[PDB]
Design a binder for this molecule. Structure first.
Ligand SMILES: [Mg+2]
Length: 482
RNA sequence: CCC
Protein backbone atom coordinates (compact mmCIF):
# COMPACT_ATOMS: atom_id res chain seq x y z
CA UNK A 1 0.00 0.00 0.00
CA UNK A 2 1.20 3.49 -0.95
CA UNK A 3 1.82 5.66 2.10
CA UNK A 4 -0.83 8.16 1.00
CA UNK A 5 -3.53 5.49 1.16
CA UNK A 6 -1.88 4.70 4.48
CA UNK A 7 -2.47 8.21 5.85
CA UNK A 8 -6.11 7.96 4.80
CA UNK A 9 -6.47 4.57 6.53
CA UNK A 10 -4.86 5.85 9.74
CA UNK A 11 -7.37 8.71 9.72
CA UNK A 12 -10.30 6.31 9.36
CA UNK A 13 -8.99 4.07 12.14
CA UNK A 14 -9.15 7.02 14.52
CA UNK A 15 -12.82 7.61 13.62
CA UNK A 16 -13.92 4.12 14.65
CA UNK A 17 -15.69 3.27 17.88
CA UNK A 18 -13.80 0.34 19.40
CA UNK A 19 -11.30 -0.43 22.15
CA UNK A 20 -8.40 1.15 20.23
CA UNK A 21 -10.08 4.58 20.32
CA UNK A 22 -11.39 4.41 23.89
CA UNK A 23 -8.12 5.52 25.50
CA UNK A 24 -7.64 2.33 27.51
CA UNK A 25 -3.98 2.49 28.59
CA UNK A 26 -2.08 -0.72 29.37
CA UNK A 27 -0.02 0.92 32.14
CA UNK A 28 -3.14 1.36 34.26
CA UNK A 29 -3.67 -2.37 34.74
CA UNK A 30 -1.87 -5.65 35.29
CA UNK A 31 -2.26 -7.21 31.79
CA UNK A 32 -1.81 -10.76 33.05
CA UNK A 33 -4.46 -10.28 35.73
CA UNK A 34 -6.86 -8.67 33.28
CA UNK A 35 -6.30 -11.36 30.67
CA UNK A 36 -6.74 -14.15 33.24
CA UNK A 37 -9.83 -12.68 34.89
CA UNK A 38 -11.52 -12.06 31.54
CA UNK A 39 -11.07 -15.78 30.89
CA UNK A 40 -12.50 -16.55 34.33
CA UNK A 41 -15.54 -14.34 33.71
CA UNK A 42 -16.16 -16.10 30.39
CA UNK A 43 -16.36 -19.33 32.34
CA UNK A 44 -17.81 -18.26 35.69
CA UNK A 45 -19.77 -15.04 35.27
CA UNK A 46 -22.10 -16.41 32.63
CA UNK A 47 -24.51 -13.48 32.70
CA UNK A 48 -21.93 -11.05 31.33
CA UNK A 49 -21.84 -10.46 27.55
CA UNK A 50 -19.54 -13.02 25.97
CA UNK A 51 -19.28 -10.87 22.85
CA UNK A 52 -18.02 -7.91 24.93
CA UNK A 53 -15.64 -10.18 26.83
CA UNK A 54 -14.01 -11.57 23.68
CA UNK A 55 -13.70 -8.13 22.07
CA UNK A 56 -11.99 -6.90 25.26
CA UNK A 57 -9.74 -9.97 25.52
CA UNK A 58 -8.67 -9.39 21.91
CA UNK A 59 -7.63 -5.84 22.83
CA UNK A 60 -5.77 -7.11 25.89
CA UNK A 61 -3.93 -9.74 23.84
CA UNK A 62 -2.87 -6.96 21.48
CA UNK A 63 -1.58 -4.96 24.47
CA UNK A 64 0.60 -8.00 25.36
CA UNK A 65 2.01 -7.96 21.83
CA UNK A 66 0.04 -11.05 20.87
CA UNK A 67 -1.72 -9.83 17.73
CA UNK A 68 -2.11 -13.31 16.26
CA UNK A 69 -3.92 -14.31 19.45
CA UNK A 70 -6.02 -11.14 19.31
CA UNK A 71 -7.29 -12.23 15.89
CA UNK A 72 -8.38 -15.59 17.33
CA UNK A 73 -10.34 -13.80 20.03
CA UNK A 74 -12.08 -11.68 17.40
CA UNK A 75 -12.90 -14.87 15.47
CA UNK A 76 -14.62 -16.17 18.61
CA UNK A 77 -16.49 -12.87 18.87
CA UNK A 78 -17.67 -13.42 15.29
CA UNK A 79 -18.84 -16.93 16.21
CA UNK A 80 -20.83 -15.44 19.10
CA UNK A 81 -22.42 -12.91 16.75
CA UNK A 82 -23.70 -15.85 14.69
CA UNK A 83 -24.74 -17.67 17.88
CA UNK A 84 -26.33 -14.94 19.99
CA UNK A 85 -26.80 -11.92 17.69
CA UNK A 86 -27.84 -13.36 14.31
CA UNK A 87 -30.86 -11.08 13.79
CA UNK A 88 -28.76 -7.91 14.15
CA UNK A 89 -25.57 -9.41 12.74
CA UNK A 90 -24.13 -6.37 10.93
CA UNK A 91 -24.68 -3.65 13.53
CA UNK A 92 -23.53 -5.99 16.35
CA UNK A 93 -20.31 -6.60 14.40
CA UNK A 94 -19.06 -3.00 14.32
CA UNK A 95 -16.84 -3.06 17.41
CA UNK A 96 -15.38 -6.45 16.43
CA UNK A 97 -14.67 -5.16 12.91
CA UNK A 98 -13.08 -2.02 14.33
CA UNK A 99 -10.73 -4.13 16.42
CA UNK A 100 -9.92 -6.32 13.38
CA UNK A 101 -9.03 -3.19 11.41
CA UNK A 102 -6.69 -1.91 14.13
CA UNK A 103 -5.10 -5.31 14.74
CA UNK A 104 -4.40 -5.91 11.05
CA UNK A 105 -3.05 -2.35 10.95
CA UNK A 106 -0.60 -3.22 13.74
CA UNK A 107 0.43 -6.41 11.91
CA UNK A 108 1.17 -4.23 8.86
CA UNK A 109 -1.59 -5.98 6.92
CA UNK A 110 -2.93 -2.70 5.59
CA UNK A 111 -5.08 -4.07 2.77
CA UNK A 112 -6.78 -6.43 5.20
CA UNK A 113 -7.40 -3.54 7.60
CA UNK A 114 -9.00 -1.51 4.82
CA UNK A 115 -11.40 -4.38 4.09
CA UNK A 116 -12.72 -3.98 7.63
CA UNK A 117 -13.08 -0.20 7.53
CA UNK A 118 -14.99 -0.66 4.27
CA UNK A 119 -17.45 -3.07 5.90
CA UNK A 120 -17.90 -0.65 8.76
CA UNK A 121 -18.44 2.30 6.42
CA UNK A 122 -21.00 0.31 4.44
CA UNK A 123 -23.07 -0.66 7.47
CA UNK A 124 -23.01 2.87 8.91
CA UNK A 125 -24.28 4.24 5.60
CA UNK A 126 -26.92 1.49 5.38
CA UNK A 127 -28.20 2.49 8.82
CA UNK A 128 -28.33 6.26 8.23
CA UNK A 129 -25.58 7.08 10.68
CA UNK A 130 -24.68 10.76 10.92
CA UNK A 131 -20.99 9.64 10.99
CA UNK A 132 -19.00 7.91 8.24
CA UNK A 133 -17.29 5.18 10.26
CA UNK A 134 -19.20 4.88 13.52
CA UNK A 135 -22.77 4.38 14.64
CA UNK A 136 -23.24 5.34 18.24
CA UNK A 137 -25.80 3.09 19.91
CA UNK A 138 -26.70 1.97 23.46
CA UNK A 139 -25.19 -1.51 23.15
CA UNK A 140 -21.83 -0.02 22.22
CA UNK A 141 -22.10 2.55 25.05
CA UNK A 142 -22.65 -0.34 27.45
CA UNK A 143 -19.73 -2.33 26.07
CA UNK A 144 -17.53 0.75 26.37
CA UNK A 145 -18.70 1.30 29.96
CA UNK A 146 -17.59 -2.19 30.95
CA UNK A 147 -14.29 -1.82 29.11
CA UNK A 148 -13.67 1.43 31.01
CA UNK A 149 -14.52 -0.18 34.37
CA UNK A 150 -12.02 -2.97 33.70
CA UNK A 151 -9.22 -0.42 33.29
CA UNK A 152 -9.70 0.74 36.89
CA UNK A 153 -10.53 3.70 39.11
CA UNK A 154 -9.18 6.39 36.81
CA UNK A 155 -11.91 5.44 34.33
CA UNK A 156 -14.95 5.27 36.64
CA UNK A 157 -16.35 8.70 35.79
CA UNK A 158 -16.00 7.94 32.09
CA UNK A 159 -17.70 4.56 32.58
CA UNK A 160 -20.58 6.21 34.44
CA UNK A 161 -21.09 8.61 31.53
CA UNK A 162 -21.03 5.74 29.04
CA UNK A 163 -23.73 3.83 30.93
CA UNK A 164 -25.70 7.07 31.29
CA UNK A 165 -25.53 7.51 27.51
CA UNK A 166 -27.00 4.02 27.05
CA UNK A 167 -29.74 4.65 29.64
CA UNK A 168 -30.67 7.92 27.92
CA UNK A 169 -31.99 5.71 25.11
CA UNK A 170 -33.21 2.70 27.14
CA UNK A 171 -33.74 3.73 30.79
CA UNK A 172 -35.24 0.34 31.70
CA UNK A 173 -32.80 -1.96 29.90
CA UNK A 174 -31.81 -4.68 32.40
CA UNK A 175 -28.20 -4.98 31.18
CA UNK A 176 -27.59 -1.24 31.07
CA UNK A 177 -28.94 -0.86 34.57
CA UNK A 178 -26.55 -3.46 35.98
CA UNK A 179 -23.54 -1.67 34.46
CA UNK A 180 -24.68 1.72 35.69
CA UNK A 181 -25.56 0.53 39.19
CA UNK A 182 -22.23 -1.25 39.63
CA UNK A 183 -20.36 1.83 38.41
CA UNK A 184 -22.21 4.08 40.89
CA UNK A 185 -21.56 1.45 43.59
CA UNK A 186 -17.80 1.59 42.98
CA UNK A 187 -17.96 5.39 42.88
CA UNK A 188 -19.58 5.31 46.35
CA UNK A 189 -16.29 3.85 47.58
CA UNK A 190 -14.01 5.84 45.20
CA UNK A 191 -12.30 9.12 46.11
CA UNK A 192 -14.24 9.49 49.35
CA UNK A 193 -13.97 12.85 51.10
CA UNK A 194 -15.66 11.44 54.21
CA UNK A 195 -18.14 8.67 54.99
CA UNK A 196 -19.02 6.02 52.38
CA UNK A 197 -21.76 7.21 50.06
CA UNK A 198 -24.98 5.51 49.00
CA UNK A 199 -25.93 7.08 45.67
CA UNK A 200 -25.91 3.50 44.31
CA UNK A 201 -28.72 2.31 46.56
CA UNK A 202 -31.54 3.45 44.24
CA UNK A 203 -29.78 2.31 41.05
CA UNK A 204 -29.05 -1.07 42.68
CA UNK A 205 -32.69 -1.58 43.71
CA UNK A 206 -33.76 -0.90 40.12
CA UNK A 207 -31.11 -3.15 38.57
CA UNK A 208 -32.16 -5.97 40.90
CA UNK A 209 -35.84 -5.51 40.04
CA UNK A 210 -34.97 -5.57 36.33
CA UNK A 211 -32.78 -8.67 36.68
CA UNK A 212 -34.72 -11.07 38.98
CA UNK A 213 -32.63 -14.16 38.23
CA UNK A 214 -29.28 -12.43 38.69
CA UNK A 215 -27.46 -13.09 42.01
CA UNK A 216 -24.40 -11.05 40.97
CA UNK A 217 -26.24 -7.70 40.92
CA UNK A 218 -28.20 -8.67 44.03
CA UNK A 219 -25.06 -9.18 46.12
CA UNK A 220 -24.13 -5.50 45.64
CA UNK A 221 -27.54 -4.47 46.90
CA UNK A 222 -26.94 -6.56 50.02
CA UNK A 223 -23.53 -4.90 50.59
CA UNK A 224 -24.95 -1.42 50.06
CA UNK A 225 -27.76 -2.15 52.54
CA UNK A 226 -25.11 -3.21 55.02
CA UNK A 227 -23.41 0.16 54.45
CA UNK A 228 -26.59 2.08 55.26
CA UNK A 229 -27.36 0.29 58.53
CA UNK A 230 -29.96 -2.02 57.05
CA UNK A 231 -27.76 -5.04 57.75
CA UNK A 232 -30.81 -7.20 58.56
CA UNK A 233 -32.33 -6.60 55.10
CA UNK A 234 -28.96 -7.10 53.39
CA UNK A 235 -28.40 -10.38 55.22
CA UNK A 236 -31.74 -11.82 54.09
CA UNK A 237 -30.72 -11.09 50.51
CA UNK A 238 -27.40 -12.87 51.15
CA UNK A 239 -29.28 -15.90 52.51
CA UNK A 240 -31.66 -15.98 49.51
CA UNK A 241 -28.73 -15.71 47.12
CA UNK A 242 -26.87 -18.55 48.84
CA UNK A 243 -30.04 -20.66 48.60
CA UNK A 244 -30.23 -20.04 44.84
CA UNK A 245 -26.64 -20.42 43.68
CA UNK A 246 -23.61 -22.52 44.54
CA UNK A 247 -19.87 -22.25 43.87
CA UNK A 248 -20.10 -19.05 41.82
CA UNK A 249 -16.95 -17.21 42.78
CA UNK A 250 -18.15 -13.74 41.66
CA UNK A 251 -21.09 -14.08 44.02
CA UNK A 252 -19.47 -15.96 46.91
CA UNK A 253 -16.60 -13.48 47.24
CA UNK A 254 -19.00 -10.60 47.93
CA UNK A 255 -21.15 -12.67 50.30
CA UNK A 256 -17.86 -13.39 52.09
CA UNK A 257 -17.18 -9.64 52.33
CA UNK A 258 -20.68 -9.21 53.80
CA UNK A 259 -20.11 -11.86 56.45
CA UNK A 260 -16.63 -10.56 57.31
CA UNK A 261 -17.96 -7.03 57.87
CA UNK A 262 -20.31 -8.34 60.55
CA UNK A 263 -17.39 -10.32 62.04
CA UNK A 264 -18.65 -13.72 60.91
CA UNK A 265 -15.14 -14.68 59.88
CA UNK A 266 -15.53 -18.47 59.82
CA UNK A 267 -18.53 -18.13 57.50
CA UNK A 268 -16.57 -15.72 55.28
CA UNK A 269 -13.65 -18.19 55.17
CA UNK A 270 -15.98 -21.07 54.30
CA UNK A 271 -17.40 -19.11 51.35
CA UNK A 272 -13.98 -17.92 50.17
CA UNK A 273 -12.59 -21.45 50.20
CA UNK A 274 -15.53 -22.65 48.08
CA UNK A 275 -14.73 -19.88 45.61
CA UNK A 276 -11.03 -20.81 45.63
CA UNK A 277 -11.91 -24.38 44.54
CA UNK A 278 -13.21 -22.83 41.35
CA UNK A 279 -10.62 -20.05 40.85
CA UNK A 280 -7.58 -20.85 43.05
CA UNK A 281 -5.40 -18.03 41.73
CA UNK A 282 -7.80 -15.08 42.07
CA UNK A 283 -6.07 -12.11 43.69
CA UNK A 284 -9.45 -10.85 44.95
CA UNK A 285 -10.10 -14.11 46.81
CA UNK A 286 -6.61 -14.15 48.27
CA UNK A 287 -6.92 -10.61 49.54
CA UNK A 288 -10.24 -11.48 51.19
CA UNK A 289 -8.70 -14.51 52.89
CA UNK A 290 -5.96 -12.34 54.39
CA UNK A 291 -8.55 -9.84 55.60
CA UNK A 292 -10.31 -12.67 57.44
CA UNK A 293 -7.15 -14.00 59.13
CA UNK A 294 -6.07 -10.47 60.04
CA UNK A 295 -9.42 -9.74 61.69
CA UNK A 296 -9.26 -12.94 63.73
CA UNK A 297 -5.73 -12.06 64.79
CA UNK A 298 -6.76 -8.55 65.88
CA UNK A 299 -9.58 -9.98 67.99
CA UNK A 300 -7.11 -12.11 69.95
CA UNK A 301 -4.74 -9.17 70.39
CA UNK A 302 -7.54 -6.96 71.72
CA UNK A 303 -8.81 -9.71 74.02
CA UNK A 304 -5.31 -10.25 75.43
CA UNK A 305 -4.56 -6.50 75.64
CA UNK A 306 -1.85 -6.75 72.97
CA UNK A 307 0.05 -9.32 75.04
CA UNK A 308 -1.04 -12.83 73.93
CA UNK A 309 0.73 -15.71 75.66
CA UNK A 310 0.89 -19.47 75.15
CA UNK A 311 -1.52 -20.86 72.57
CA UNK A 312 -2.94 -17.39 72.00
CA UNK A 313 0.53 -16.29 70.94
CA UNK A 314 0.90 -19.39 68.74
CA UNK A 315 -2.43 -18.68 67.05
CA UNK A 316 -1.60 -15.01 66.50
CA UNK A 317 1.64 -16.05 64.78
CA UNK A 318 -0.16 -18.64 62.61
CA UNK A 319 -2.74 -16.03 61.62
CA UNK A 320 -0.05 -13.48 60.74
CA UNK A 321 1.73 -16.09 58.62
CA UNK A 322 -1.52 -16.97 56.86
CA UNK A 323 -2.39 -13.33 56.25
CA UNK A 324 1.07 -12.73 54.79
CA UNK A 325 0.70 -15.76 52.52
CA UNK A 326 -2.61 -14.61 51.07
CA UNK A 327 -1.78 -10.88 50.81
CA UNK A 328 1.46 -11.87 49.06
CA UNK A 329 -0.49 -14.07 46.63
CA UNK A 330 -2.93 -11.21 45.94
CA UNK A 331 -0.09 -8.82 45.14
CA UNK A 332 1.72 -11.37 42.99
CA UNK A 333 -1.44 -11.98 40.93
CA UNK A 334 -2.32 -8.28 40.50
CA UNK A 335 0.59 -5.84 40.34
CA UNK A 336 -1.78 -2.85 40.32
CA UNK A 337 -3.69 -3.94 43.47
CA UNK A 338 -2.66 -1.10 45.83
CA UNK A 339 -4.37 -2.45 48.95
CA UNK A 340 -2.69 -5.83 48.49
CA UNK A 341 0.69 -4.07 48.88
CA UNK A 342 -0.20 -2.02 51.93
CA UNK A 343 -1.99 -4.89 53.65
CA UNK A 344 1.00 -7.18 53.01
CA UNK A 345 3.50 -4.52 54.13
CA UNK A 346 1.49 -3.71 57.25
CA UNK A 347 1.34 -7.41 58.14
CA UNK A 348 5.11 -7.79 57.61
CA UNK A 349 5.48 -4.83 59.97
CA UNK A 350 3.17 -6.40 62.56
CA UNK A 351 5.30 -9.54 62.50
CA UNK A 352 8.45 -7.46 62.84
CA UNK A 353 9.67 -8.43 59.37
CA UNK A 354 10.89 -4.91 58.68
CA UNK A 355 13.11 -5.69 55.67
CA UNK A 356 10.11 -7.42 54.08
CA UNK A 357 7.80 -4.50 54.91
CA UNK A 358 10.29 -2.00 53.49
CA UNK A 359 10.62 -3.99 50.26
CA UNK A 360 6.85 -3.99 49.73
CA UNK A 361 6.33 -0.36 50.76
CA UNK A 362 9.12 0.62 48.34
CA UNK A 363 7.32 -1.05 45.44
CA UNK A 364 4.02 0.49 46.52
CA UNK A 365 5.52 3.99 46.63
CA UNK A 366 6.79 3.51 43.08
CA UNK A 367 3.40 2.59 41.55
CA UNK A 368 2.96 5.54 39.19
CA UNK A 369 -0.27 4.64 37.43
CA UNK A 370 -2.68 3.87 40.28
CA UNK A 371 -5.27 6.51 41.33
CA UNK A 372 -4.22 9.53 43.40
CA UNK A 373 -6.48 8.23 46.16
CA UNK A 374 -4.44 5.01 46.35
CA UNK A 375 -1.14 6.94 46.23
CA UNK A 376 -2.44 9.05 49.16
CA UNK A 377 -3.17 5.95 51.20
CA UNK A 378 0.20 4.38 50.49
CA UNK A 379 1.91 7.53 51.84
CA UNK A 380 -0.31 7.42 54.92
CA UNK A 381 0.54 3.78 55.67
CA UNK A 382 4.27 4.21 55.05
CA UNK A 383 4.19 7.29 57.28
CA UNK A 384 2.62 5.29 60.09
CA UNK A 385 5.20 2.49 59.63
CA UNK A 386 7.93 5.16 59.92
CA UNK A 387 6.36 6.76 63.00
CA UNK A 388 5.52 3.66 65.02
CA UNK A 389 7.85 0.92 63.83
CA UNK A 390 10.96 2.74 62.61
CA UNK A 391 10.49 5.60 65.12
CA UNK A 392 11.65 8.00 62.41
CA UNK A 393 9.66 11.18 63.00
CA UNK A 394 11.16 13.10 60.10
CA UNK A 395 10.39 10.37 57.57
CA UNK A 396 6.90 10.09 59.02
CA UNK A 397 6.40 13.84 58.67
CA UNK A 398 7.63 13.68 55.09
CA UNK A 399 5.13 11.03 54.07
CA UNK A 400 2.19 12.54 55.96
CA UNK A 401 2.88 15.72 53.96
CA UNK A 402 3.06 13.79 50.68
CA UNK A 403 -0.27 12.14 51.53
CA UNK A 404 -1.95 15.54 51.92
CA UNK A 405 -0.25 16.99 48.83
CA UNK A 406 -1.75 14.16 46.75
CA UNK A 407 -5.21 14.31 48.35
CA UNK A 408 -6.21 16.88 50.98
CA UNK A 409 -9.85 15.92 51.39
CA UNK A 410 -10.20 12.28 52.40
CA UNK A 411 -11.25 10.33 55.45
CA UNK A 412 -7.56 10.45 56.45
CA UNK A 413 -7.28 14.26 56.43
CA UNK A 414 -7.63 14.91 60.18
CA UNK A 415 -5.47 11.91 61.13
CA UNK A 416 -2.79 13.39 58.87
CA UNK A 417 -3.04 17.02 60.08
CA UNK A 418 -3.14 16.05 63.77
CA UNK A 419 -0.13 13.71 63.45
CA UNK A 420 1.77 16.49 61.67
CA UNK A 421 0.91 19.07 64.30
CA UNK A 422 1.92 16.67 67.08
CA UNK A 423 5.24 15.61 65.58
CA UNK A 424 6.24 19.07 64.40
CA UNK A 425 5.39 20.65 67.75
CA UNK A 426 7.49 18.04 69.59
CA UNK A 427 10.44 18.49 67.26
CA UNK A 428 10.22 22.29 67.59
CA UNK A 429 10.43 21.96 71.38
CA UNK A 430 13.83 20.36 70.90
CA UNK A 431 15.03 22.56 68.02
CA UNK A 432 13.19 25.84 67.32
CA UNK A 433 15.03 26.10 64.03
CA UNK A 434 13.86 22.74 62.64
CA UNK A 435 12.97 23.71 59.08
CA UNK A 436 10.99 20.60 58.20
CA UNK A 437 8.73 21.06 61.20
CA UNK A 438 8.24 24.80 60.62
CA UNK A 439 7.40 24.07 57.00
CA UNK A 440 5.03 21.27 57.99
CA UNK A 441 3.09 23.54 60.32
CA UNK A 442 2.94 26.24 57.66
CA UNK A 443 1.51 23.63 55.29
CA UNK A 444 -1.12 22.35 57.72
CA UNK A 445 -2.30 25.82 58.82
CA UNK A 446 -2.56 26.83 55.18
CA UNK A 447 -4.69 23.72 54.57
CA UNK A 448 -6.87 24.62 57.59
CA UNK A 449 -7.45 28.13 56.23
CA UNK A 450 -5.36 29.84 58.90
CA UNK A 451 -3.58 32.12 56.42
CA UNK A 452 -1.85 34.39 58.90
CA UNK A 453 -0.54 31.59 61.12
CA UNK A 454 0.63 29.66 58.05
CA UNK A 455 2.47 32.73 56.76
CA UNK A 456 4.23 33.07 60.12
CA UNK A 457 5.50 29.48 59.98
CA UNK A 458 6.66 29.78 56.37
CA UNK A 459 8.34 33.10 57.22
CA UNK A 460 10.27 31.46 60.08
CA UNK A 461 11.25 28.61 57.73
CA UNK A 462 12.25 31.09 55.01
CA UNK A 463 14.36 33.06 57.51
CA UNK A 464 16.46 29.92 57.97
CA UNK A 465 16.39 28.85 54.31
CA UNK A 466 15.92 32.17 52.42
CA UNK A 467 16.28 30.86 48.87
CA UNK A 468 13.87 27.97 49.32
CA UNK A 469 11.63 27.77 46.26
CA UNK A 470 8.77 26.01 48.05
CA UNK A 471 8.58 28.64 50.82
CA UNK A 472 8.59 31.57 48.40
CA UNK A 473 5.78 29.99 46.39
CA UNK A 474 3.74 29.20 49.52
CA UNK A 475 4.05 32.79 50.76
CA UNK A 476 3.05 34.14 47.33
CA UNK A 477 -0.06 31.94 47.29
CA UNK A 478 -0.96 33.12 50.80
CA UNK A 479 -0.65 36.76 49.65
CA UNK A 480 -2.71 36.37 46.48
CA UNK A 481 -5.58 34.36 47.96
CA UNK A 482 -9.10 35.85 48.00
C1' C B 1 -10.61 -6.05 45.94
C1' C B 2 -8.17 -2.21 52.61
C1' C B 3 -10.36 1.33 56.32
MG1 LIG C 1 -9.43 -7.51 38.97
Amino acid sequence: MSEIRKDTLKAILLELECHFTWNLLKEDIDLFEVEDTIGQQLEFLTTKSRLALYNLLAYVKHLKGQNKDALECLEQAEEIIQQEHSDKEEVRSLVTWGNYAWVYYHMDQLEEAQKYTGKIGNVCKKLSSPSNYKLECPETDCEKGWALLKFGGKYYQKAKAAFEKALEVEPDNPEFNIGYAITVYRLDDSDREGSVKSFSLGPLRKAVTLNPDNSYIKVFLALKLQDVHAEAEGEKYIEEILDQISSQPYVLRYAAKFYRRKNSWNKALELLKKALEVTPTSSFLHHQMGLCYRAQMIQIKKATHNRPKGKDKLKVDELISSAIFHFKAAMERDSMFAFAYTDLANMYAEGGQYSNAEDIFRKALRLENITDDHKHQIHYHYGRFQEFHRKSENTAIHHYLEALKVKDRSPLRTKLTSALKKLSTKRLCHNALDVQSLSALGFVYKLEGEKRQAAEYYEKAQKIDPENAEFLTALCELRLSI
